Structures are given as C-alpha cells and as structure tokens.
C-alpha cells in the first residue's frame, strides 16, 4: 500500500496550507478509479489517494478502466479499456443485475448514471456498456475487509488504515474467514518463494532449496533468515514443502512474513465475549486471558541496531580497544580480545557495547584530587573515557556483528578510520496497554492481564479469550463484528444441513454443495456478494457439537455462562463466539519518556529531547492559563524558573534536595534579562525603579 498510492502534494504541485477544502472532497468522476476510503486520518484528507483494483495507466498518463459492452441485451465478453471522458457520453450499467444466462435481463428497467453523475432509472434500450464486477470503487487493502456494506465508512477508514500497522507473529495461522484477496495478494507481494520453473523438488534445507528442473539443470534458493526491517521487525523465511514434490511454475515453496499457505494473516482466531464486566471493559477497554501469554501466541520480534565509528581528531585519533580507564572487570569479562562484546551476551541498560577511548590533551587537575591520586597511587592517563553504552529500557541478545575499517579497503566517508554495527534482537511478551484492534475499526488497549480461572467459560467449561464491551456497538455503528461472530462460530462449529427432502428458502439459491462443514473450516465471503441475512440465521440452524450432544449456542446465537468469580450461572444468555483479531506497533517502551536531570541546549538552557535523550516534556500555554485559573503562582514560579532556564538555581535546589534542606527562593529568571540586553543593544534607555 505504500505503492499504488496517489499523492497530491509535492514539487510541481500544490502547497499544503495554501490549497482549499474543495480539491479535498470527492466528485462523481472519482468512481471506479480511485477508492475514496483509504486516506490518513490526520491533516492529509483529500491529499492522499489510493488506486483501485482494475485500473490501468494510459500511455498518455491517465486512468483506463475495462468495461463489458452489451449489444441489444446481449452482454459480450469484449473487454474494452475505457477512460472517464468518453464515459460521459455513454451508458454504464449495473453490477448486481438480473442477468439471465446469456447477458439478458429479467427486468426491463435499470438504474443508470448520467454525465452529471445523477442516478437515473431507465428502460433497457440505451445500454451499450456494463460493469465488469462489484468492488470497482474498492482499493486493494480495502478489499480485504469483509462485511463492509453493513458498517460505517468512517470506521472503515479507521480500521482500514489500521491494518497497515500490524506486526508479525511467530506462528502465522491463517484467518478463519476472509475473501478472495489474501491468496491473490501475497503472490504479487514478492516476499514469498514463488516457483519459477515447473520441476520437481530435489533437496531442501533449513536455509536453501535445491530444486530439480524437468529439463536438466538445477537451482538452489537461499531464503533470507532474520533480516532486519526499516522498523526492526523480522524478515525470516521458512520452508513449507517436502524434498520430492512435483511442483509447477508459480507455486509457493516457502513463505516469509505474516503469510501462511499462500495468504496473509494478521493475527489469530480467538473466542470473544460481548458482555460488560466490572468496568474492565469501560469505554473501549480491552481485557485478555492468561493462556495466551503462557502459550506465547502473541510473541513479537524486535531488532534494534546501534552503530558508532572510530575517527580522527585534531589532536589525534579515536581508539577502539580492550584497554579501558578506571573501571570494573565484571564489566569486561564478556568482551572480546579487542574491545567489542562477543556473540550471545544478554545486556541490561547501562552496559558497555564498544570500548571507545579518545585522548584528552594536557590539562591541569585540582590539587585535592591530585593528592588522592597520590594516595591511591594511580595516575590514570591523558585520555578520555568515552565508550559506547546501551540506551535504556532495552535488553535482548546480540546476533550479528558488523565492523568496517578505513585501512581495510572499506569505502566510508572521510575523517573516519573504522566503523562498527550491532544488531540486538529481543523476544517481547505481550503486556498491558498495547494497541489491539479488530478489522471493523474497533480498537483499544489492554487493561488487565487476568489469571486463567477468573474468566467466563462454557457449560463444557472452555474458557474465553477476550471480552468486549456493549456500547461500542450503537454509536460507532460497527455490527460487522457481530456478523463475523455468528459466521465465525458457524465455522468453528461446522454444520451438516438436514434438508434431505427439501432445501429451505434461505439456502435455496446461494451455492449448492455447501450444506455440510467439517469444523475448523476454511471459508470466505467477497466484498458485496457474500452472504445474506436469512442465510446467516440459516447456518446457525445446524450445530455439530464438540463431543457430546450439546447445543451450546442456540438458534439466537447466545450461550448460558457461569460466573468465573463466584460461580453461579448468569440470568441471561450472552452473545459470544469467534473473531479474528490483530496486533499493532505502539509498544510501551516506544512512547515512554522520563527524566529528572540530563543534557541541555547550548543556545538556551532548556532540556534537549531526542532519541538517545530522555526527552523532555513540552509545557504549553493554555496550561499556564489554567495555572492562573487556580492561581497557584508558586507552582508557576517553580516551573518557568528553576526547571527551565536559570542555571545557577539548578545547582542550589538540587543540592538542597541532596541535603534535604529548605527549598530556596526562586531567583531572577536570567533568560528574561537577555531580552533587556537586546533592548539595550538598540538605543534604548530601559530602566527599572
């Protein structure tokens, strides 16, 4: 989706604030060519478009679209790429049309669009051209979203935008229910091993596959193993087949990322509950079950990279070595012969990565410390102890070691003698507060990781996975999760429809040959032509039970459940079932920041905040207005003075905290006096009285 992407702004294009809110909206010419759904939620609406499925580029530089052409009520297969300009003159028919076996219409009266785009209803005489399909207004990532036609387009914009931010897991079970896109998606993605030549398998490995082509020659295929992303995710690849298989050109041999069995997978199938419970689902709060963390089913992979070099200075050169200034040896016994640490060390924050040391120069010391150095009998050296250490809240093993040097023929920019890189990976458990969502735009964070026993559970006693709250339903208009709840439990359950004498009217048309299901099934519904509502109620009417004769889920799709806390059954049947969920990338180490005392700017005395900095917390304006609204002015005098800009106070209040003495009075903000000097620079007798 970074590709196929339509952008408005840029060089040779408009200015962002200087373009009005009229180019942003859609026009009826946008139909069939650019999906109106996929756009970022922030200040880019109308600026970033998304290219649809069946579009194609004009050699002149425009969008061309195929359409089926009908002559005299006979629809041909004559595929004609068309532009919107000639489309204005012409007659575009309807996708879901009562078409009878030739291209012939049952009805004579058909909905149609004019060149204005107004929806008119016409007799079946003028129609030259017909739609090829449904989903023509739909982009690619839009097309993986089932039951779109039953929920809000705004929520569709939300969760549609959310699915690009999914993370890979380590298991990759296929989703229980999808559409005809996911198998069709990854085969053009090119992260998955596609069979180039139709041959037979000769011999595989864990890391390579040596194939046997039918005509003579062979070929090996090195799969990539644990490659680092641009964001630090896992790009491991893995074989799925055996060593002697007659394969065909185009087939899947091995998959890499989130895909499985030829199709994408953003998570797992889980058992869902729809009750509100003890405020732990309070306004989109989400809870979990204990089994998943212990069965590790949501485990993530994160690779973080560090890099530093050895350079030259005016005095001399930087040094990478095992020789350190004054330091412990416990912090050295995991390092190699020549500085850097060895393979497979587990670090904590503050540990030393690369031994880096530079010369000082020739300075003087205090006589008191020079005395102590005579007392402890150790002059150190004329160098500086400035080595590479790990940033904070970080752990994990180091896998790869990459290292360059100027004297060793390595091309690298000037002033530099030597380079090194570090790759640090880490298994991370799922914990509280992380960003979880379902496909229908519903989302939220993890409040409480429960034990396994305080949990809703069946008459057969099977514990539930998550519980969702009621009130996300009405006002956000997102009942498609309920739809796939019923259909999902139909899939886990399985059926065999007992119409041995006569098919019911819900199932009288849809396909044939479908009226059974072996459970743990593999099903799909397309975008606009999937199931219908009485059919959904119809599949619930067959209820192939787990072990014994047991209708746990009634004809209204609810179950009777027990208290997992005190024990008694609940006095109402509860909507429950299965839902396919997913996990995103906003972990708690990412957005955490904290600081008592650190680095500051050189221009101002303000704290500086970046990646390797602790971060600083930007305090605004209306905040100060509300501080005035309390009138807690001593707080304000604390904030803007001893915490912001006055250097000479910071040592005083910090040292007072050290001794536990009184809080000193906040002195004059010296940053204020800087303005006065600027006024005195410009012919101003300014004065205080």
């Amino acid at each position: 989706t970074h590709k196929r992407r339509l952008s408005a702004l840029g060089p040779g294009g408009l200015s962002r604030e200087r373009a009005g809110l009229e180019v942003r909206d859609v026009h009826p010419s946008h139909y069939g060519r650019m999906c109106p759904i996929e756009t970022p939620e922030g200040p880019n609406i109308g600026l970033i478009g998304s290219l649809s499925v069946y579009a194609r580029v004009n050699p002149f530089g425009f969008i061309e679209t195929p359409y089926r052409k009908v002559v005299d009520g006979v629809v041909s297969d004559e595929i004609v790429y068309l532009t919107a300009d000639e489309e204005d003159r012409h007659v575009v028919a309807q996708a879901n049309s009562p078409i009878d076996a030739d291209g012939r219409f049952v009805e004579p009266r058909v909905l149609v669009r004019r060149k204005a785009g107004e929806v008119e209803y016409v007799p079946s005489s003028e129609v030259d051209y017909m739609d090829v399909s449904p989903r023509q207004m739909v982009s690619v990532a839009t097309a993986m979203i089932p039951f779109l036609e039953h929920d809000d387009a705004n929520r569709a914009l939300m969760g549609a935008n959310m699915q690009r931010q999914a993370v890979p897991l380590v298991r990759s079970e296929a989703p229980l229910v999808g559409t005809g896109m996911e198998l069709r998606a990854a085969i053009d993605a090119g992260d998955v091993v596609v069979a180039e030549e139709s041959g037979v398998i000769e011999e595989v490995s864990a890391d390579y596959i040596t194939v046997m082509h039918d005509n003579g020659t062979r070929r090996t295929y090195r799969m990539r193993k644990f490659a680092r992303s641009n964001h630090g995710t896992c790009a491991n690849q893995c074989p799925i087949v055996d060593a002697g298989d007659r394969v065909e050109a185009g087939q899947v041999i091995a998959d890499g990322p989130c895909t499985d069995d030829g199709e994408m997978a953003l998570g797992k199938n889980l058992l869902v509950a729809i009750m509100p419970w003890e405020g732990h689902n309070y306004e989109d709060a989400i809870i979990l079950s204990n089994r998943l963390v212990e069965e590790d089913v949501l485990t993530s992979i994160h690779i973080e990279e560090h890099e530093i070099d050895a350079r030259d200075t005016k005095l001399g050169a930087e040094e990478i070595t095992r020789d350190i200034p004054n330091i412990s040896d416990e912090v050295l016994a995991d390092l190699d012969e020549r500085g850097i640490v060895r393979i497979g060390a587990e670090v904590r924050d503050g540990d030393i990565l690369v031994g880096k040391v530079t010369p000082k120069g020739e300075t003087e010391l205090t006589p008191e410390e020079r005395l102590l150095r005579a007392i402890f009998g150790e002059k150190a050296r004329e160098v500086r102890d400035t080595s590479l250490k790990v940033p904070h809240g970080e752990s994990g093993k180091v896998i790869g070691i990459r290292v360059f040097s100027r004297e060793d023929e390595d091309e690298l920019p000037a002033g530099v003698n030597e380079l090194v890189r570090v790759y640090v990976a880490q298994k991370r458990k799922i914990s509280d507060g992380d960003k979880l969502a379902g496909r229908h735009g519903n989302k939220g964070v993890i409040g409480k990781i429960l034990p396994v026993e305080d949990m809703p559970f069946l008459a057969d006693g099977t514990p539930v996975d998550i519980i969702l709250n009621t009130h996300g339903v009405p006002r956000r208009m997102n009942i498609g999760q309920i739809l796939e709840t019923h259909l999902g439990w139909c899939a886990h359950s399985g059926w065999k429809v007992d119409a041995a004498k006569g098919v019911p009217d819900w199932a009288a048309r849809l396909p044939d040959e479908l009226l059974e299901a072996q459970p743990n099934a593999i099903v799909s519904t397309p975008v606009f032509d999937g199931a219908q509502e009485a059919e959904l109620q119809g599949l619930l009417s067959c209820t192939l039970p787990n072990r014994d004769g047991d209708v746990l889920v009634d004809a209204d799709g609810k179950a009777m459940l027990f208290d997992g806390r005190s024990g008694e059954p609940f006095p109402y049947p509860v909507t429950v079932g299965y839902m396919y969920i997913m996990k995103l990338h906003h972990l708690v180490d990412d957005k955490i920041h904290a600081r008592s005392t650190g680095p500051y700017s050189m221009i101002t005395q303000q704290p500086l905040g970046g990646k390797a900095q602790f971060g600083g917390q930007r305090f605004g304006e209306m905040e100060c207005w509300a501080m005035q609204a309390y009138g807690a002015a001593y707080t304000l005098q604390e904030l803007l003075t001893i915490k912001s800009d006055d250097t000479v106070g910071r040592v005083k209040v910090y040292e007072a905290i050290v001794k536990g003495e009184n809080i000193p009075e906040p002195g004059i903000p010296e940053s204020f006096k800087v303005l006065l000097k600027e006024l005195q620079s410009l012919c101003l007798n300014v004065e205080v009285l």
């Binding site: 196929r4 089926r68 090829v132 899947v252």
Partner: peptide
C-alpha cells in the same frame, strides 16, 4: 482457481468473474 498450490476455500460468489485481476505491480 488458477493457482497451483492453492488450498481450498469456499466462497459465496453468486456471480462469476469473467476477467481475472491484473498484475498489481504493473503500475
């Protein structure tokens, strides 16, 4: 459906599709 190593997945397509999806990287 025109895919060699495809697993079976049952659908609710009432219609057919006369034209297949084109290649996505062709843009």
């Amino acid at each position: 459906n025109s895919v060699p190593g495809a697993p079976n997945r049952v659908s609710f397509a009432k219609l057919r599709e006369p034209l297949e999806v084109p290649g996505l990287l062709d843009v």
